[PDB]
Every structure is written in structure tokens, then in C-alpha cells.
From a paper:
Lactoferrin-binding protein B (LbpB) is a lipoprotein present on the surface of Neisseria that has been postulated to serve dual functions during pathogenesis in both iron acquisition from lactoferrin (Lf), and in providing protection against the cationic antimicrobial peptide lactoferricin (Lfcn). Here, we present the structures of LbpB from N. meningitidis and N. gonorrhoeae in complex with human holo-Lf, forming a 1:1 complex and confirmed by size-exclusion chromatography small-angle X-ray scattering.
One complex was observed in the structure containing one molecule of Lf (consisting of ordered N- and C-lobes) and one molecule of NmLbpB (consisting of an ordered N-lobe, but partially ordered C-lobe). The overall structure of the NmLbpB–Lf complex has an overall L-shape. Importantly, the C-lobe of LbpB contains several long anionic loops, however, none of these were observed in the electron density likely due to their flexibility. The interaction of NmLbpB with Lf is mediated exclusively through the N-lobe of NmLbpB with the C-lobe of Lf. Interacting simultaneously with the C1 and C2 domains of Lf, the N-lobe of NmLbpB has an extended interaction interface that includes residues N154, R193, S201, D204, N213, R223, K230, Y253, Q255, and S258. In the NmLbpB–Lf complex, the interaction interface is stabilized by extensive hydrogen bonding and salt bridge interactions encompassing a buried surface area of ~1760.8 Å2.
Numbering used by the authors:
A (entry chain B): 5 to 692
B (entry chain A): 34 to 343, 352 to 371, 378 to 450, 528 to 627, 632 to 678, 698 to 713
Write the structure that this text describes.
């Protein structure tokens, strides 16, 4: 019907009512109002379909993202000016200019906070002050340690009955004293600064822009300083060097599914146009009457920026801030163990099982996280819930475009083998050959007429399976409709209702068809080749070593036993066909090796664990096959390609552009101009 | 190859060093003046993990290499060493010191444009902080906790504005310019006690294989007239580590006292921990001394440190248990004597010139620094916790035509003394290598397909015996009897048959009369076996290598190793 906005306070209902009338006056998108008592009540109301949207601080975006609520940000507040907009702000500590203490030597002082569990108010300052709190750890609430650290403080929303020290510095004129509302004069960014301006406390944990919006001109702002994490005091203007954290802007959150995302953005877009900054005389959408702080939106905000649908609470907050909130309810011992361990990300249940075997033998250095698809696993390491994974070159482009870096490369046989290699770790990589495989009986099959046939692919967006073949066909047609290059295909990761999935066969029960992991029997290098071997498709796009390892009894599976290498040929870029052995002269393109990717803050530790684990469980390891093997073992093509000899160093090619190569990266982004890639659109928003 | 199982952070070493960083203080870009508002080209220069130097050789030899690096950069500048500071510790196998120069009369490193504006300007100071070790420990204290005492050095990054308002480095506790234009170093600490600036303490628990330690800075004391004015120790780092072989890895964490009390003086340089970025090892034949290093998470501090030591109740039944075996018996041969070969306890890895090189099946060649090239051939795939073989070092400078000299070695990781079976009998079978000597020479390759080298020992009785066949039976071979295994290892006697077969020309017989055999058990529950046969005195492996209890010489050598089956 309309967009139901949720108001967490009695005055926020009044402004929202003012909002409803003005939209009807200009005949704009309608907006109704629902009244609740707290942001968490608004989050619960949205999950019940009794409301649709609410503006939320980053500390409550995290709460909205937890089960069973799972609300996602859809529009981020924009601060600054139209010509210099910003979707992030800085958590700062503001103090009087009289020196005498720094960010560490503030025990026994008086603090002003915007509110419990708020980003600059609570989460950032308490997180950085934790080593000085002498906190016993969870489940005992950290408020007790804080209430014992400072002499007294004003923390709006804190439990007044259990931690009265956290409320003694507020002035609510009655039972509105420690209120999470504008009825407390020391409440918001602006409110907590008043607690410092009045002299109630000696430190205010607020925004970097409160002083500029609350102090008239550059005469009283010189009375206040900033506390930098390096324990130095710097002027207010240098908040970019003297901030406690850089955090994302407050955002509008809604339901993940059936959340009225289109209507919410349409409403906010037109309200910004009509009642934004320096606009229609009455009813500015930002800022509102006497003694009121940030009614439904941040005061002196200029507009909104739309958030791509893929972004959840974890991705929106960023790994640094997301784990900081999580660490506030993990024990100090738990925090250290997480930082010292490598959390591998598995794709599918089968890869999860293999990781669980590995974790018990890693001596506490490897644990496991699981995601349904590779892009999901990339999001997990992006959020910090995961650390590393081995990616095909095409996925390395995605992870690199999202900020992840390659760490080690899957080394294959060299261009001069001569032995099982002892210095494999230092042997430079040489790539692998992507080929088009056809049954030798079909002699009319040439590369000049490959289109319109039935194709088998490893998975969408992969190098040998998708990027190299489709890029060659796209370079000669200009057609973005890849579902029409072939009549039918099995391209795992596509639309299951599309004909790009019409050839996939799913698991042994026939379900989970076209899913891009090991559950789909036509997934990957060997699955695509099997799709050709069972006459499902006419041409398979795999690497050349796959055909060699799955023919002539090299694979004892029923679908691969009795398969002869002589029954297969390769489509060269001539129209001529050649045997699989001559792939060095009948390949499509060189493909960069699969590589392990991670965040920059984990590269050194990841190198330590992997270089030690593959010494124990790698090929020709001490405990392989007696205990466990990372590479080809009782498990095939899980977490690592079976043709991997070792994880080798990158020789300086530590970025996705340097590693993948200039020409291969240029080719991928050319194809990506046709597609949407919700993960890429999410990272484009984030890296901005 | 190279060291393929470690990063530069956790890599084992007999010596490691870091060079003094020097940030670019130039105020000009390569074309025109600095667009940043009165900034410099490089205001923050952290340390680099790839700039960690790894050393090799004796304690003196490692120091001279660092001195050579400084002397290569500047013509005739005086080089200052830490030999005066190290005197009060009397280290016998370790060093935690520094080498540096002040570059008297030498201008800064400069690069200018054609017009004249300079875009590179680095202070001509130069220096190192390093740790060095000799004789990596082959045996360690059996049990208990052992107190270690010593010192430590450090080197920080370069940051222009530590306090934000351009203060002097002397106010922050260092000699002028140190910490601002170059890294802050322990050898230019200004606010420390001159009597002992950077003492270090350690507590090693050999029961639980854990290490604890404190890196301490003695703060400045005003009055130097009283020789016993109380010290003012301040803990900077808390050290935790877990033992592995004769080495250990762990973390360094800044003490909270530094964070809360010295927030504006010491916390400016010691503010980030080194989590899983600390490593070290024990040096001396019996773990008398230790040395190690660390680099913090953000590459802000690189520290080095050193330490020295201050029946059947438990595992402490002699105070010393052999941890590993690494020895060699030095074409014509070389000096026929045994000598401990430096090693960290990795049988399939050989420590040559500071770097660990992996050992493959057979017949690999590695090249040395001086120019000599040595080719090694070690034993076989079935042995995993003990390796045998031989190597010959050659200097290929005599240009002919088409086509320490030859040494036999033994390497393995021992079993714990509370891990050897005390009940039953077991059978081992392996291979063996042997060389004759200076007269008519006879080499015997270790094969595992031509040499039998069978063994048997009753752990309940401790009566190890065995034979190592050459052609058929034990007639052209040796016999080993009178076992009497002892704790971690064993010692026996070597006899042959009436003669030995080498090839009526001249049947080359070999005779042996109750020669000395010594060896040990390697790995898990006595998985494998290994030993040597030699004759100079009661001086071999097995018993903690004290080389006593005799006394004649000869020139012959044979090394063996075997694995068990049933
Ligand atoms: Fe906030």
C-alpha cells in the first residue's frame, strides 16, 4: 500500500506525521508512520511486516542483521556537501584543551556517550579501551567493567538499576534520566557534546562534525581537542589523523525479502528532492525543533545513497568494524585464538567435510566456514568470518575487485618436469591450457560452427570453463546474451530455469541442478568433461590435463573407466581438430593458475600455516596419505585442484592485476560490461 | 632451492639482522615542489619483512659480514659494535648486539633534478641489530623449569611526527634524529640506565615445552655517584613461546604498564604486539644459551634477544637428553674424525650456510657462497625420522676436459626418553654406507635394495644386535653384538667375519676387532634406528655428546639406519 516508517520516540512520530502530510501535498510517494519504543522494537516490527523501514546507526544495523530479523541496509545517509559527499564518518573523542591525559590514561574520569551499543558513542570507544578495563569477559556484561572504569558517565540506554554509575551524569528531570531518547538532553551526538560543554564530563565520544554544527564559529572550537589512538592530542580540524575509527554512515534497513525496497528508495529519492537541504520553506527533512536530536534522520544530512541488494549488515559495516562488535561479546582468550587461526572457506558440504578433517590435524591453526557458492565464500572473508580459499582465475578477478589479494598459487607440473620438485614453492607458475573437447566421432564439429551446439562448462565466470571460451565468442559477435550462444548447456551457477542449465543433472537424487559446487555432478573440470562423456553436450570447455587424467583408466569411476583418449579431439582456432596430447598447439588460451586469496591483514599468518600444513599433508608430505592429504587423495578436486603439487610463492605478483596479467584482466572486465554480478556491484559501492 | 616451509618471520636461523631504515626527508617531487602542504617525501617508513637478513657462520664471522655491508656503503667511517656491552654477559654461543656507524663527514644520500631541486634525501646513518648463534643444541635439559638471563636489542620504524608538533628525539628518549629521520634503535637509547640498559629474563618449562620471558628496559636514574642506587626496571614486552626441537615459536606483547603509564614516551614506539611473529632457538650442546627475534604486527619494531643459564625422580635423570643427531665423518677422503653438524631437528632438511635446503631421494647438487660446489646423496624413501648418506664438496676451478672432501653423515630426530618401549622385542631393517680410508679404497652406497642392515633389540632386555649384509649372508659384512641400549640411544661393539670382500690378483680382505658402535632411536615409539661406527675414543653420539671415557686412531667409517616392520 504505502511505506511504513518506524518512529522510536514520541517526537519522531510528530515529524513523521509532518512528513506524511507534506508528501500528500506534493502528491509524492506516500509514507505512513508506526510508533515503537526503541530501535530494536522498530527492527522487530519490520520483521513482523508491521513496519517497513527505519534509520539506524551502525551499531544497530548489526543487531538488525542477526537472526531471526536479518534486515539489510538499503539507503545510506550522505554527509558533507553535494560537491564533496561522503558516506562515512569518524568516531572521535573530544576533550578540553588542558592536556594532562591521553586516550589510555583516562581511568577514573567522566565520559559522555551518545548511547549504549552505538558506533561512535559506545562500540568504538569501549573496544579500544578494553585492555584497560580489567573485564572478566563474557557472559558477564562489559557494562560492569566500564561502570567501574570511569568515575561516572552518561550512557543513554544503559540499565540504570544494574549500572547506576553509567547514568549518574545524565539530567533527565525524573525517570527520563538515562533515556535512549531526545528527552535526555545529553542523548545523541549533539547531546553527548553538551555533556562535555556543560563540564559534566572530561571526554565526549561523538562524531567528528558535532563541534562544527554546534559551535558558532572558529572561536569556541579552539577550546576542544581530539584524542588520537597514538596517545597524542591534536586540534579538531585534523580528525582524519586523530580519529578512533572510520565507520559507515547510518542507513535505512528493511526486510531481506519482500522488504518494499523499490518503494523505500522511491520515497527517499523524492523527499530528498523536495524537502532536502536548502529547499521548500517549511519541513526540512533533516533537523527539527527545540531540544530534539536527529529525528528519523541525521541533522544536517544532505541525502541518501542506494545500497546494492547483495550487501548485508556484515558487508556494510566492513570486516574491521564487524569483528570489533563481535569481539565485544567474545572472551579475550577467544579473540586471540581467532586472530592466530586460519578460517578456511569451503564451497559445498563435501568441501566442508574435508576441511573438518583438516582442522583436527592442523594443531589449532585451521578452522572451517562454509558457503553455498564461491561468491558467498568471498563475502565471508570480506566480512571476516572467513580467511582464505583457493580460487579459479576468474574468481580471483572478483576477489581482487573486492580488495582481496592473492597469497599463494596452486603450482602444477612445469614446462620441464624432470622430477617431483623439492623447490616447488619457489618455482614460478606457468599457467594451464584451456581447451575445447569434442567426441572424435563428430567430425563436422569445428570451432567455426561451435555455436548452437550443446556445451558443458565447469561453472559460470570461471577461466577455462566460461571466461576464455565466451570471451572469444564475444570478441566476434558483440552479443551479451550468453544464453543464446548454445542451444542447451550445463553452466553451473546460472539461472536454473534457463537453458544454460538444461543439461545439468544435479546430485544422485536429481535435485540441486546447476548448483555451482560438487553436489552438481556436472560441476567443475571433471563434471563438465563427464557432461561430454555421457553425450549430454557436444563440446566441453575444460583444461587439457583434465582429459588426460580422466581417460585410459586413470580414473576408476564408472563414467570414466572405459573412456579412451583416442575417442576425443580438441577444437583448435583453425577449424581443424587435433588429439588431446597436442593441446600445446591446439589450445584456446593460457589460463592463470588457481590461487589462494585473503585479506591483506592475514597474508603473513596465512603463509605460515599453509607452508607448514602442506609440508605435512601436501603431496609427498610426512602425514600423507597415512593421515591426511590436502591434494588428490580419498578426495578429488575439493579445496584444491588434484593437479596441484604445492602452494608456491607469487614472486611479487601480490595483486589480482599483477598476478592474473594485464591482458587477462582486460578481457574479463570487457565481458563484465554485459553482466550485473551482485557481488561486484556490492564491492563497487563499498570501495567508494 | 631455498627454505620452502617458512616465511621470513618464523624462519629458523643461526643469525638474523635488520638494517636501519632511513625515510626520504626531501621536500620536492621529481618535477616540482611538494604538493602536500609543507610535507616531506616519506614521512612514515615502516620496517619490511622482506628486508630481514639471515646470517651464517661463527659469531665473529656473522658480525664481520654486517660490518662489511656498512663498509661497502661508506669509504672509511668508524663502525661501532656492541662488544663492550656484551662483556657483562659472557656469552659462549650467542649474541644480541648491534653494528652501526655515524658516517662522520659523509653527506646524505641525495638525488636531484636537472634544475637542482633534490627529491631524495636520506640520512647517511647506517646500522644493524642482530642475534647470532653457534652450535644449535642437540640435547636439552630433560625436565623442570630453567631460568635464563640476558639482554635484548630493538630497532623501530621512522615517523616524522610522533607527538604531532615536531619535538626533539631527545625528549622522546633517543639520540637526536633517531625515530624521526631514521629508525629508533636500542643502541641510541637515551633515557635508559647506562649500567644495564636492556636486561632480559626468561623462564623455560621443559616439562610442558613452553617458554616465558620479559624484555625489560632499566629507566634513567638521576644520580650516578652511588653505584647501587636502585634500578628502575620497566617491562616492555612479555614473551610466550612453545618449544619444537631445539627451537621455539611464539608471540611478543607490549606490557600494559607501558600502555597506561608511559603513554606519551614509550607507547609511541612500543604500541603493537608481535602475535605469532616470534621465533628462536637454543644454542650450546646442552641448551646453555638461547637467542631469538621478533617483528611486530605493523612492522614498527624488530627486536632481538639472547639468554644464558643462570636417578629417577622424573624425566630429570641426568639433566640432559639427546634431542637430535646431526654429525658427519670427514676421490680421496678428509680428516677422519667426527664433528657435530649444525641442525634444527629436521631430518629431511640440511642446514647449509644459514638456509635450510630440502633433502631429496638421491643425487642433488647445491652451490656454496665461496665458490665450492657440494653434491649430496642421502638415503631412502622408507626412512622418515632418520637420514643417512654422503656428500662431497668440490671447488670446480681447474679447467680440464670432459669427464673436507668426502664426508658421511647421520641425521635424525630422537624419541623422547619417556617414549621408548620398556617391554618386548622388535626387528628393524634398513641400509648402510661405508668408506674404507686412505689405503685401498672401498665405498658402499646405502641402497635399501642391495644392503640388508637388519637389527633386533629386546626393549625389555636392552640387548640390541644386528648385521648389515653386502653380498650374501654376513660373511662379507660386519656383526654388531653386546647391545646394552641406554636411555635415548645405544652403544655396541663391531666385529666382522674372518675377512671382508672388496672385489689370484689380491683378495682385498678387511679385518675388525671389537670396534665401537653408537647410535639412537628416532621419532615415535622407536619407529626407526640409526648409528655409526668409529674409533678414536668413547666420543660419539648416543650419550650426551661430552666426548670422554677412553685411545687410538684409525681411518674408517660406516653409518647405518633402519626402519621396523612386523
Ligand atoms: Fe553513530
Amino acid at each position: 500500500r504505502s511505506v511504513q516508517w518506524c518512529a522510536v520516540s514520541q517526537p519522531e512520530a510528530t515529524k513523521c506525521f509532518q512528513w506524511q502530510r507534506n508528501m500528500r501535498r506534493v502528491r509524492g510517494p506516500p509514507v505512513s508512520c508506526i510508533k515503537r519504543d526503541s530501535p530494536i522494537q522498530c527492527i522487530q516490527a519490520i520483521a513482523e511486516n508491521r513496519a517497513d523501514a527505519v534509520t539506524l546507526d551502525g551499531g544497530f544495523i548489526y543487531e538488525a542483521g542477526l537472526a531471526p530479523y536479518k534486515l539489510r541496509p538499503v539507503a545510506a545517509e550522505v554527509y558533507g556537501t553535494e560537491r564533496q559527499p561522503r558516506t562515512h564518518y569518524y568516531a572521535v573523542a573530544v576533550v578540553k584543551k588542558g592536556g594532562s591525559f591521553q586516550l589510555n590514561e583516562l581511568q577514573g574520569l567522566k565520559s559522555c556517550h551518545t548511547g549504549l551499543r552505538r558506533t561512535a558513542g559506545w562500540n568504538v570507544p569501549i573496544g579500544t579501551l578494553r585492555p584497560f578495563l580489567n573485564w572478566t569477559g563474557p557472559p558477564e556484561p562489559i557494562e560492569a567493567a566500564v561502570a567501574r572504569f570511569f568515575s561516572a558517565s552518561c550512557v543513554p540506554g544503559a540499565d540504570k538499576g544494574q549500572f547506576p554509575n553509567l547514568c549518574r551524569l545524565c539530567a533527565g528531570t525524573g525517570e527520563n534520566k538515562c533515556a535512549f531518547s531526545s528527552q535526555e538532553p545529553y542523548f545523541s551526538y549533539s547531546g553527548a557534546f553538551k555533556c562535555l560543554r556543560d563540564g559534566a564530563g572530561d571526554v565526549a565520544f561523538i562524531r567528528e562534525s558535532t563541534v562544527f554544527e554546534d559551535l558558532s564559529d572558529e572561536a569556541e572550537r579552539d577550546e576542544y581537542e581530539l584524542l588520537c589512538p597514538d596517545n597524542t592530542r591534536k586540534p579538531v580540524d585534523k580528525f582524519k589523523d586523530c580519529h578512533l575509527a572510520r565507520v559507515p554512515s547510518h542507513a535505512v534497513v528493511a526486510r531481506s525479502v519482500n522488504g518494499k525496497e523499490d518503494a523505500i528508495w522511491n520515497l527517499l529519492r523524492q523527499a530528498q528532492e523536495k524537502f532536502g537541504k536548502d529547499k521548500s520553506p517549511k519541513f526540512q527533512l533533516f533537523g527539527s525543533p527545540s531540544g530534539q536530536k536527529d529525528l528519523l534522520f541525521k541533522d544536517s544530512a544532505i541525502g541518501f545513497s542506494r545500497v546494492p541488494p547483495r550487501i548485508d549488515s556484515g558487508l556494510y559495516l566492513g570486516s574491521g568494524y564487524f569483528t570489533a562488535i563481535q569481539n565485544l561479546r567474545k572472551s579475550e582468550e577467544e579473540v586471540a585464538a581467532r586472530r592466530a587461526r586460519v578460517v578456511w572457506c569451503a564451497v559445498g558440504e563435501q568441501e566442508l567435510r574435508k576441511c573438518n578433517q583438516w582442522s583436527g590435524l592442523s594443531e589449532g591453526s585451521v578452522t572451517c566456514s562454509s558457503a553455498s557458492t564461491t561468491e558467498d565464500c568471498i563475502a565471508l572473508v570480506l566480512k571476516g568470518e572467513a580467511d582464505a580459499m583457493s580460487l579459479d582465475g576468474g574468481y580471483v578477478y572478483t576477489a581482487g575487485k573486492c580488495g582481496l589479494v592473492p597469497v599463494l598459487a596452486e603450482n602444477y607440473k612445469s614446462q620441464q618436469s624432470s622430477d617431483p620438485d623439492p623447490n616447488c614453492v619457489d618455482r614460478p607458475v606457468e599457467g594451464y591450457l584451456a581447451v575445447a573437447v569434442v567426441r572424435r566421432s563428430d567430425t563436422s564439429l569445428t570451432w567455426n560452427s561451435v555455436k548452437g551446439k550443446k556445451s558443458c562448462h565447469t561453472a559460470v565466470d570461471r577461466t577455462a570453463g566460461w571466461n576464455i571460451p565466451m570471451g572469444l565468442l564475444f570478441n566476434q559477435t558483440g552479443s551479451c546474451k550468453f544464453d543464446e550462444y548454445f542451444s542447451q548447456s550445463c553452466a553451473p551457477g546460472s539461472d536454473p530455469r534457463s537453458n544454460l542449465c538444461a543439461l545439468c543433472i544435479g546430485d544422485e537424487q536429481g535435485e540441486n541442478k546447476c548448483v555451482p559446487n560438487s553436489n552438481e555432478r556436472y560441476y567443475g573440470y571433471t563434471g563438465a568433461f563427464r557432461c561430454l562423456a555421457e553425450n549430454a553436450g557436444d563440446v566441453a570447455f575444460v583444461k587439457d590435463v583434465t582429459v588426460l587424467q580422466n581417460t585410459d583408466g586413470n580414473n576408476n569411476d564408472a563414467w570414466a573407466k572405459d573412456l579412451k583418449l583416442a575417442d576425443f579431439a580438441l577444437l583448435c582456432l583453425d577449424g581443424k581438430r587435433k588429439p588431446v596430447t597436442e593441446a600445446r598447439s591446439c589450445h584456446l588460451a593460457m589460463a592463470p593458475n588457481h590461487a589462494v586469496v585473503s585479506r591483506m591483514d592475514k597474508v603473513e599468518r596465512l603463509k605460515q600455516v599453509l607452508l607448514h600444513q602442506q609440508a605435512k599433508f601436501g603431496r609427498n608430505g610426512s602425514d600423507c596419505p597415512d593421515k591426511f592429504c590436502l591434494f588428490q587423495s580419498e578426495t578429488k578436486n575439493l579445496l584444491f585442484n588434484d593437479n596441484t603439487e604445492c602452494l608456491a610463492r607469487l614472486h611479487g605478483k601480490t595483486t589480482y592485476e599483477k598476478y592474473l596479467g594485464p591482458q587477462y584482466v582486460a578481457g574479463i572486465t570487457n565481458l563484465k560490461k554485459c553482466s550485473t554480478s551482485p557481488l561486484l556491484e556490492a564491492c563497487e559501492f563499498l570501495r567508494k | 632451492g631455498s627454505s620452502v616451509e617458512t616465511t621470513p618471520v618464523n624462519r629458523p636461523a643461526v643469525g638474523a639482522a635488520m638494517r636501519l631504515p632511513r625515510r626520504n626527508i626531501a621536500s620536492y617531487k621529481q618535477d616540482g615542489t611538494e604538493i602536500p602542504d609543507k610535507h616531506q617525501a616519506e614521512e612514515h617508513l615502516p620496517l619490511k619483512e622482506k628486508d630481514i637478513l639471515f646470517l651464517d657462520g661463527t659469531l665473529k664471522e656473522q658480525a664481520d659480514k654486517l660490518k662489511k655491508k656498512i663498509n661497502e656503503r661508506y669509504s672509511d667511517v668508524r663502525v661501532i659494535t656492541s662488544k663492550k656491552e656484551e662483556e657483562k654477559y659472557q656469552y659462549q654461543f650467542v649474541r644480541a648486539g648491534y653494528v652501526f656507524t655515524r658516517a662522520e663527514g659523509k653527506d646524505n644520500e641525495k638525488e636531484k633534478t636537472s634544475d637542482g631541486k633534490e627529491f631524495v634525501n636520506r640520512f647517511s646513518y647506517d646500522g644493524f641489530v642482530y642475534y647470532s648463534g653457534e652450535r644449535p643444541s642437540q640435547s636439552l635439559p630433560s625436565a623442570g623449569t630453567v631460568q635464563y638471563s640476558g639482554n635484548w636489542q630493538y630497532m623501530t620504524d621512522a615517523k616524522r611526527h610522533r607527538t604531532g608538533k615536531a619535538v626533539s628525539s631527545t625528549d622522546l628518549g633517543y639520540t637526536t634524529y633517531y625515530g624521526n629521520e631514521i629508525g629508533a634503535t636500542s643502541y641510541e637509547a637515551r633515557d635508559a640506565d647506562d649500567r644495564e640498559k636492556h636486561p632480559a629474563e626468561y623462564t623455560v618449562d621443559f616439562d610442558n615445552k613452553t617458554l616465558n620471558g620479559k624484555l625489560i628496559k632499566n629507566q634513567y636514574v638521576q644520580n650516578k655517584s652511588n653505584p647501587n642506587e636502585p634500578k628502575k626496571p620497566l617491562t616492555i614486552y612479555d614473551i610466550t613461546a612453545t618449544l619444537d626441537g631445539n627451537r621455539f615459536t611464539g608471540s611478543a606483547k607490549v606490557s600494559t604498564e607501558v600502555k597506561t603509564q608511559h603513554a606519551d614516551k614509550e607507547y609511541l614506539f612500543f604500541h603493537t604486539d608481535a602475535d605469532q611473529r616470534l621465533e628462536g632457538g637454543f644454542f650450546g650442546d646442552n641448551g646453555e644459551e638461547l637467542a631469538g627475534r621478533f617483528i611486530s604486527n605493523d612492522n614498527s619494531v624488530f627486536g632481538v634477544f639472547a639468554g644464558k643459564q643462570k636417578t629417577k625422580p622424573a624425566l630429570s635423570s641426568g639433566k640432559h637428553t639427546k634431542i637430535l643427531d646431526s654429525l658427519k665423518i670427514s676421490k680421496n677422503p678428509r680428516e677422519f674424525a667426527i664433528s657435530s653438524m649444525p641442525d634444527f631437528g629436521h631430518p629431511d632438511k640440511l642446514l647449509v650456510e644459514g638456509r635450510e635446503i630440502p633433502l631429496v631421494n638421491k643425487e642433488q647438487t647445491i652451490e656454496l657462497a665461496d665458490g665450492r660446489k657440494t653434491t649430496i646423496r642421502t638415503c631412502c624413501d622408507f626412512l622418515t625420522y632418520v637420514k643417512i648418506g654422503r656428500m662431497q664438496t668440490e671447488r670446480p676451478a681447474a679447467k680440464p676436459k670432459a669427464q673436507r672432501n668426502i664426508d658421511l653423515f647421520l641425521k635424525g630426530i630422537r624419541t623422547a626418553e619417556t617414549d621408548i618401549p620398556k617391554t618386548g622385542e622388535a626387528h628393524y631393517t634398513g641400509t648402510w654406507e661405508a668408506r674404507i680410508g686412505k689405503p685401498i679404497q672401498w665405498d658402499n652406497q646405502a641402497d635399501k635394495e642391495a644392503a640388508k642392515a637388519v637389527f633386533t633389540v629386546d626393549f625389555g632386555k636392552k640387548s640390541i644386535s644386528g648385521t648389515l649384509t653386502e653380498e650374501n649372508g654376513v660373511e662379507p659384512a660386519f656383526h654388531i653384538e653386546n647391545g646394552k641400549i641406554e636411555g635415548n640411544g645405544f652403544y655396541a661393539t663391531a666385529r666382522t667375519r674372518e675377512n671382508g670382500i672388496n672385489l689370484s690378483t689380491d683378495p682385498k680382505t678387511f679385518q675388525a676387532s671389537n670396534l665401537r658402535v653408537e647410535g639412537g632411536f628416532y621419532g615415535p615409539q622407536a619407529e626407526e634406528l640409526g648409528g655409526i661406527i668409529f674409533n678414536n675414543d668413547g666420543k660419539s653420539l648416543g650419550i650426551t655428546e661430552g666426548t670422554e671415557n677412553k685411545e687410538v686412531k684409525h681411518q674408517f667409517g660406516v653409518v647405518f639406519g633402519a626402519k621396523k616392520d612386523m
